Amino acid sequence: ADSDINIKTGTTDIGSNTTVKTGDLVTYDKENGMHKKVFYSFIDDKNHNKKLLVIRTKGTIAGQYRVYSEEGANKSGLAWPSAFKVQLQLPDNEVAQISDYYPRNSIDTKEYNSTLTYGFNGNVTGDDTGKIGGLIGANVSIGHTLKYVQPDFKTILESPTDKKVGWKVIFNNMVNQNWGPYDRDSWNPVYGNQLFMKTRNGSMKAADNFLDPNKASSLLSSGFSPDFATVITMDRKASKQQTNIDVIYERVRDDYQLHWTSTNWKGTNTKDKWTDRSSERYKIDWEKEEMTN
Amino acid sequence: ADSDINIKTGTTDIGSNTTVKTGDLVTYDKENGMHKKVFYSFIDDKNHNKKLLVIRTKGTIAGQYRVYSEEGANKSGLAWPSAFKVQLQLPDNEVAQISDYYPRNSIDTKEYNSTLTYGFNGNVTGDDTGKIGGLIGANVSIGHTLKYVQPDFKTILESPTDKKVGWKVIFNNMVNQNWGPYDRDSWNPVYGNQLFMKTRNGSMKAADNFLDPNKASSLLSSGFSPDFATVITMDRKASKQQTNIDVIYERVRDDYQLHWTSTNWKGTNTKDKWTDRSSERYKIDWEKEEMTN
Amino acid sequence: ADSDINIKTGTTDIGSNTTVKTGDLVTYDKENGMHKKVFYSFIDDKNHNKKLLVIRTKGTIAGQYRVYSEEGANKSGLAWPSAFKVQLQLPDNEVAQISDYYPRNSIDTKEYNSTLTYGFNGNVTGDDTGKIGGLIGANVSIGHTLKYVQPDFKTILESPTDKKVGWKVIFNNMVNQNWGPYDRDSWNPVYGNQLFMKTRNGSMKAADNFLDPNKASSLLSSGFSPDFATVITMDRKASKQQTNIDVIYERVRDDYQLHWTSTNWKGTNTKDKWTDRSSERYKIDWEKEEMTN
Amino acid sequence: ADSDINIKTGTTDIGSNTTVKTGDLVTYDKENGMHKKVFYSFIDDKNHNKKLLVIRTKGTIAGQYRVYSEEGANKSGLAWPSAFKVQLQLPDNEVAQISDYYPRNSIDTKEYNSTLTYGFNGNVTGDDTGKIGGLIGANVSIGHTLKYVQPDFKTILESPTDKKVGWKVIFNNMVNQNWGPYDRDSWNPVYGNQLFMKTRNGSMKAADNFLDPNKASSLLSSGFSPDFATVITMDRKASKQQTNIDVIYERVRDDYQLHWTSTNWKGTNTKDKWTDRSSERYKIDWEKEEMTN
Amino acid sequence: ADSDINIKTGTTDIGSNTTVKTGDLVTYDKENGMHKKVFYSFIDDKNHNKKLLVIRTKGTIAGQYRVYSEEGANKSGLAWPSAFKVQLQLPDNEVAQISDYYPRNSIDTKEYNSTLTYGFNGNVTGDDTGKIGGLIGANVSIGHTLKYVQPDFKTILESPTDKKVGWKVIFNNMVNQNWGPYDRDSWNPVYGNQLFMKTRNGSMKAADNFLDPNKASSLLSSGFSPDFATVITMDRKASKQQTNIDVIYERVRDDYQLHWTSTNWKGTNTKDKWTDRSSERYKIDWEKEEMTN
Amino acid sequence: ADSDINIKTGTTDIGSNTTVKTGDLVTYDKENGMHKKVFYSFIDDKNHNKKLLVIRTKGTIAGQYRVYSEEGANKSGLAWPSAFKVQLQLPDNEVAQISDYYPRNSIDTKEYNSTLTYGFNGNVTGDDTGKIGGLIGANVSIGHTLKYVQPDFKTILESPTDKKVGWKVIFNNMVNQNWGPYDRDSWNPVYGNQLFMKTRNGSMKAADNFLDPNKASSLLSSGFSPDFATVITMDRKASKQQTNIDVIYERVRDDYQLHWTSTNWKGTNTKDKWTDRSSERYKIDWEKEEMTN
C-alpha cells in the first residue's frame, strides 16, 4: 500500500481531474442461455502515458442442470455445468494491449496440526477370594491433522498475454446430502461416482434419482454471474484509434449418468461432453470514447 | 476493486453531477398476504451511454404457517411456505433491458479435516502369587471431518435474461428442537418426516402436535422481506420512452400432514401443494422519470 | 449495495438538500411499567415522489420478573415476560401508507459436522510361563454434530400491511445455572419445567426458590428497549394532509409456578396468562411537519 | 440503519447548524470514595421539536475490597462490592423528561451443540496353543455441549420512567485461581463459599487467607468507572426554564467471612450488608444553557 | 502508526501539492510465457529532499505445469514451477538508488498447546456364582499440539541493495487429494515422492498418472501475478538525469518423474532443472518524467 | 483515545497548518550486507512547544544463513542470524532529546483451560454356560491446557533514554519440518540441538544435512526489514541548532554445527559467535530542516 512506502494514500492512482465516459451493453443469447453485460469506462487521464479502458464483464451464465436422456426406468442422464468461462481477446494486429485484470490467482493455504501424547497408568486389583492384582502400562501417540477450506467452484485467472485474458470458474467438489465431498473423479466399486446420486438403492425411475438442484450448488442450475475486470491501454499516438475486442462466454457441461445394476444404482461421469459458446465482437473507438456492438 | 487496478476508487461509478429522481410505490394484497413496495431511482447520467433505472423490490410476504385442516384428533394438516419468489418481467417487445441485479449466487464452501494417528503402548501385570506378564500393542486410525454451514433458507438468483429476472428464497433445512436438521425429504420408517412434529408419542390432538412457530424459522410464519435490486437500461434515442414492467410476488406452500398410526405420530410432506401469485404492472416513463401503477 | 451495480455510493438515497424536521415525544405509562418514546423525522425530499415520515419507537418496557404469588411454604408463583411487542397502525380511512420498516426477519443458520473414523490395532501377550497371545481388531465410527447459536430472545418482524406493522421480541430459551437451556415447554417427569427453579429439593419457602433475576436474562426484570423504525409515505396531493396513527407497547407474561411434591420441587409454566397493553394515538400533520400526542 | 430504509446516513440525526454548549462538573466524595463527574451538552436544535440535554455520568467508584474485621487467627471478615449503581432523578413536578439513555440491555446468547455417534468394531484373538477367538460389538452415544461467555460483572439498564433512570453494574461470578467460577451463592459442604478463599487449609491467620485483590476482578478493589448517557428533553415553551435533577452514585457491599473449622477453612457470604450512597443535586438552566451544583 | 506518536495521520507522507506523472508499459514474452507490465509513478515533491519513482511490477507469469517427456509407457516427466521471481537492477554506475520496496518478509508464527491430564477410577465386579471383585486405577497424560498455517507458496523479499531488489514466490508444500502435504523432498520408500502422483497402482501409462492441474494450486498451471512495488530515489542535482534499469521475470521449473516399478508407481523430483529468464531494459528520464522501453 | 475523553478526534495531534519537510537517505553496506534507509520528517508546528523530527529507520538487513565451514563429510558448520538490531544515539552533549518511539513492548497473553469430568458406567455380561455377571465403575479426571502463540522472532524495544533508543528482533523458536519448535537451547541426548538438522540419520555429507532455508524463517536468509520510528524534540531556543545522531544496524550470528556420531547426526549451537555492525552518522540541521549523511 502507498502508506507502506511513505506516500500519501491514492497519490499514484489514475483518474483524478478527468471526465470518465461509461457505458452499458447488454446481449441475451437465448440458444446458449447467457445474459451478457459489458460495463465499460474510458479514462483518458492526461497525466498518464496512455488512454485506458476498463471493461467489466458481468451478466449471468445459466447453469442448466437437467435430465436430458431417459432410456427406461433403469437408465437416465444428467447434463451439468463443470465450468463457466469468460474470455476477451484482441486481434493479433491491434496495437492496444491488455494491461491489467482482476481477480487473479490467490495462493491457497491449509492448517497443519501435530500432536504428541505420552501417558502412564497403574491399576490395583482384588477379589472376594483374596487375590490381589497389579497393572502398569505406558503409551505414546502421534497424530497429524490437515485442515483446509474447499469452495464448490474455484475461480481461476487463465494465463494472460498482451492480447488475451480470461477466467474459468471450475467445479471443484461438492457435498451430497452431508456426504463426500464428491468430484468428477470420485469412484466407489459398488456405486461408482455418487456425485449427483439421490438414493443408493431407491426403487424409483432413474430420471427421478438425481439430486434436487436446490440441495446442490446454485451455480449448477440457476447459474454463475461473472464480475471480472480487464484493463486495456492505448497509445494516444497509435495510428489507428479503433480497436476490436472479441468476448466469449462459455459453459462446459459434463454428462452424469445413473443405471440400475440389479441391486443398486451406479453413477458415471463423462467430462466435457458439451461446450456452449457465445461470442461477441465489440468496437472500441478511443477518440469518441465509446464502445459498441 | 478499483485500487487493484491502480484506479482512483469510485472513478468508474455512475451518478456524479446528476439529479436523481426517486419514488416509493406501495401495494398491499390482502388475499395473498403480501406487502409489496417498489423503491425506484432514475439516473440519467449524461456521461453514461444510456438512461438508467434502479428498481428495488422490498416489502414482505407473510409466511402463513398454519393448521388448515383437522380430520379428527388423529389427523391434521399444516400449510407452510417452502418458497418465496420475486420476479420482474419486461414484455418481449420492450427496447429497455435488464442490465444488472443484486444479490447474485455466491459459491458455497466447506471445510475438510483429515486426521491420522498412530501409537504404541506397553503393559505389565501380575498377581499376589509372583506371576509376571506383559502386553504390547500398536494402533492406527484415520478420520475425516466435514464442516458446513447451512442456512434455513437459501437466497437464489434465478437465471436472468434481458427481459426477465427473479429470485427465489427456498426452504433448505431446519433444526427441530435440537434434532435434525430436517428437510422436505427427511424420512424415518417409524415417524416419517419429523420436520414440524412437536412430539413423537404425544397423546394430544393432531392439530396440537405441530411445532411452535416461535421455535421454527421466523420466515415460515411472520414472513420474508425481499431486498432485491434490478437495474434497467434504456437507449436515449428510443422512439418510445415508456416501458411497461410486471412485478410478481409469490409464495409456494407445502402440505405437512400428521396422523396417528396407533403407537406414535407419523408425518408426511407434499411439495408445492399451493402457489399464491400476486402480479402487478407498472409504467415507467423515462422522460418524466417516474414510475406509476 | 450501490457499488455492486456500478453506481456511486449513496446516489440512490433520499434526503439530500432537504431540511428535515425532527421531534421527540415521551409518555410514561406507570400502570403498565412502560417508558414510551417516539423519535420522528419528516423528510420532504422534492426529488422523491412522496413525503416521508420516519417513526422510531424506542424507550423501554420493564420486564417485571417477580415472585408475585405465595400460597403457603409449598407453593409460589413467578410472573415473567414471555414477549415484548410494539405495533403501529394507521386507520382504514387514511391515505398515508407503511412503506418500510427495520429490523426485519433474518434467515437463521447452523453448522453441520460429519465425521467418519476407522482404525486397526494389533496386540501381543506373554507371561513368565512361556504363553504367548495375540490380538487383532478394527473399528468404524460415524459421528454427526449440530452446532448453533441460540439467543435468549428472538426479535421478529410481524407480517406487515400498508396500514399496520409490528415487532415481537419473544422468549426463546435460557441457561439456568450452567444447565439447560430450558424454554416454555421444558418438561421432566420428576421436576417438571425447571426454567426458573433455583434448587431441585432445597428446604426453604417456595417463594425463595426462584432464580435470582441477576442470573437470568436482564430483559426479564429490568427490561427491553425497543429500537424499531417505520417509514410512512404520503402523496403530496392527497386531500387530507393529517394522519392519525396508533402506537401500542405490549408485554405478555407467563406464570411459572413451583410446588413441593413431598421430596422435591416441581415447576409448571402457564403461557400468556397476562397481557399488559398500552396504546396511544398520535396526530401527524404533513403540512406543518409535526407529530403530536 | 438509515441505509436499510434508503435514507442518507445521518439524515435524521439532531445537532446540525446548532451551537452546542458543554460543561464538566466534578465532585469527590471522600467518605464514600467516589470520584463523580458529569459531562453535559445542551443541544437546542431549532429543527427539533424540543430542547435537549445529554448528561454523561462518568468518574469512578472505588471498589474498596478489604478485610474489615478480625477475631483471632480463626475468623476474619472481608467487605467487597457486589454492585455499583448510578441513578438520575427529576423531581416529580419537573416538566422536563428523560427521553433516552445508553447503554441499554442486550439479548444474551449461548451455543448449543448436539452430537450423535455410532460405532462398530470386531476383534480376533489367539494364543500359542492354537486357540482362536472372536469379538463383535456396537455402540451409540448422544452428547450435548453448552457454551457461553460469563462476564465478571453485568452492566444493566434499570427500568426507566420519564423521571428516573439508572444503571447497576452487578457482580456475576468469578474465577478463583483457575477454579469455579464462584458466585454469591456458591456452596460446598466442606468449604462453604470459596469465592475469595486463598487456601483451603493454609496454616495462616484468617485475615491473611483472602484472595490477593490482584488475582480478582479489578473492579472489586480499584473500582468501576461509569460511562452512562442520559438524554433529557424540554418544551421550549415551558414557563419555567430551570430544572432540578438529583444524581446518585452507590456501592453495595457484601460480607465475606472465613473461619477455621479445625480441619479446614470455610467461607460465608452475606448479601447487601452495607450500602454507600452519595447523592448530589444539580441545577439545569435551559436558557443560559448551563448546569451547576 | 502516526497516531501512536501523537502526529496527525498522514502528516509525514510524500506527495501533497505535487503533480504526479504515471504510465503503463506492457511486454509479452511468448517464448517464456510471461505477461509483463510496469506501472510507474514519478513524484517530484519539492518538500521532499529527492525525486522519487515508484515502479510497480505486475502482469502474470504462466505456471506451465506440463508433461514434457515420455520415455515409453512406464516413465514420464512433468515440468512444474517451483519458483516465480521478479527482480529490478540498476547498473552499478547509476546515481539513482533503490530506496524502498513492498511487500517485505513477515515474521511467521505458530500455536503451541500443552495439556496435562490425570484421572482416577474405580470398578466393582460380580457374577452369578457370588464372586465379587474390585479395581482401582489412576493415570496421567501429557500432550503437546503444534498448530501451523502453511501456504502453498511463500512470497519472499530477497536481500536488496541500493542497486538491486527482487522477490521470489517459491513452492512450499501442497495437498494431493487430501493427502500430504507433500514438498520437493517428500519421500516414501515404496512410492518415492508422491507430490503430483495421481494413482499409486493405476494401470494407465505414466503420462496419464500426473495430478490433474485443477486439483493442484492454480499457480502451477495458470500462473502467478506479481504485485510488487519498488521505490527509486534520485538526487535533483545529479548531472545525468537519465537512468537505465533492468527488470527480470523468471520461472524456475522442477522435473517430477514417475516410473512403474513392477508393482506400483514411484516418483522422483529434480530441483531447478530449468530456468526461464526474461529480461528487459527500461529508460528512466527524470526530467521528462517518463519511462520507456 | 480522544473520543474516550469526550474530545474531538485528532484535536491533540501535532502537525496541522505546518509545512513538513521530508527526506530519504540510503546507504548500502556491502561488507555487512545491509541496505540502510532513513526517511525523515521535520515538523515545526508553531502551536507545539518544540520542533520535532520523526526518523524512520527502514531498509533490510540480509539474514545470511549459510554453510561457512566443511571439515570432512562428518562435520560442517552453519552461521545464522539469532538477532537483528537497529539503534539510534545522540551524543552526550546534545540538547535535542529522544521523545517517543514506535513500536514498543506489548503485554503477551496466553489461554488457560481447565476441565473436570466424571461419570459412571454399567456392564452386564453373560455366556452359554449360564454365567450372568455385572460391573459398575466410576471415574473422575482433571486436565488443564495451556495455549499461546509463538512468533519465530520477537520484536523488542530496548530500554530507551533521552539520548538512545533501539530495537532488537531476536530469534525465539521455530518449527523444523513439523517437529519442535526448537530454540537456541534445545537439547536431545541423542541428537543434541536439532534446530537446523535436515535428517537424523541421512548418509549425505554434513554440509548437505542442514535445513533448506525455504523451509525455515525467511528472516534467516533473505532478511529482516526494520520499520521503526523515533521522534526527536528540540527547543527552538537551543543555542546550537545542529544535532548529530549515530545509527547502528546490526546482525548477531550463531554457529550451528552438525557432526556424525557414527550412528546418527548430532547438532550443536553456539550463541553470538559473530556480530556484524554498520554505523552511520547523520547531521540534523533544525534551521534548514535537513538531515544528511
Swiss-Prot record, chains A, B, C, D, E, F:
Changing residue 259 to I/P/R/S: Nearly wild-type oligomerization, hemolysis and target cell binding. The gene is hly. InterPro entries: Aerolysin/haemolysin_CS (IPR005831), Bi-component_toxin_staph (IPR003963), Leukocidin/Hemolysin_toxin (IPR016183), Leukocidin/porin_MspA_sf (IPR036435). Gene3D superfamilies: Leukocidin/porin MspA (2.70.240.10). Belongs to the aerolysin family. The keyword Phosphoprotein does not apply. This is Alpha-hemolysin. It comes from the Bacteria. NCBIfam families: hlyII (TIGR01002). The mushroom-shaped heptamer is composed of a cap domain (comprising 7 beta sandwiches and the amino latches of each protomer), 7 rim regions whose protruding strands may interact with the membrane bilayer, and the stem domain (52 Angstroms in length, 26 Angstroms in diameter) which forms the transmembrane pore. SUPFAM superfamilies: Leukocidin-like (SSF56959). The lineage of its organism: Bacteria, Bacillati, Bacillota, Bacilli, Bacillales. One of its GO terms (biological process) is cytolysis in another organism. Pfam families: Leukocidin (PF07968). Changing residue 144 to L/P/R: Decreased hemolysis, wild-type oligomerization and target cell binding. The keyword Oxidoreductase does not apply. PROSITE patterns: AEROLYSIN. GO terms for cellular component: extracellular region. Its main location: secreted. Keywords: Cytolysis, Hemolysis, Secreted, Signal, Toxin, Virulence. Self-assembles to first form a non-lytic oligomeric intermediate, and then, a mushroom-shaped homoheptamer structure of 100 Angstroms in length and up to 100 Angstroms in diameter. Interacts with human ADAM10; this interaction is required for toxin pore formation, disruption of focal adhesions, and hly-mediated cytotoxicity. Alpha-toxin binds to the membrane of eukaryotic cells (particularly red blood cells, RBC) forming pores, resulting in hemolysis, with the release of low-molecular weight molecules leading to eventual osmotic RBC lysis. Human RBCs bind much less alpha-toxin than do rabbit RBCs. Heptamer oligomerization and pore formation is required for lytic activity. It is found in: Secreted. One of its GO terms (molecular function) is toxin activity. Changing residue 144 to L: 16% of normal hemolytic activity.
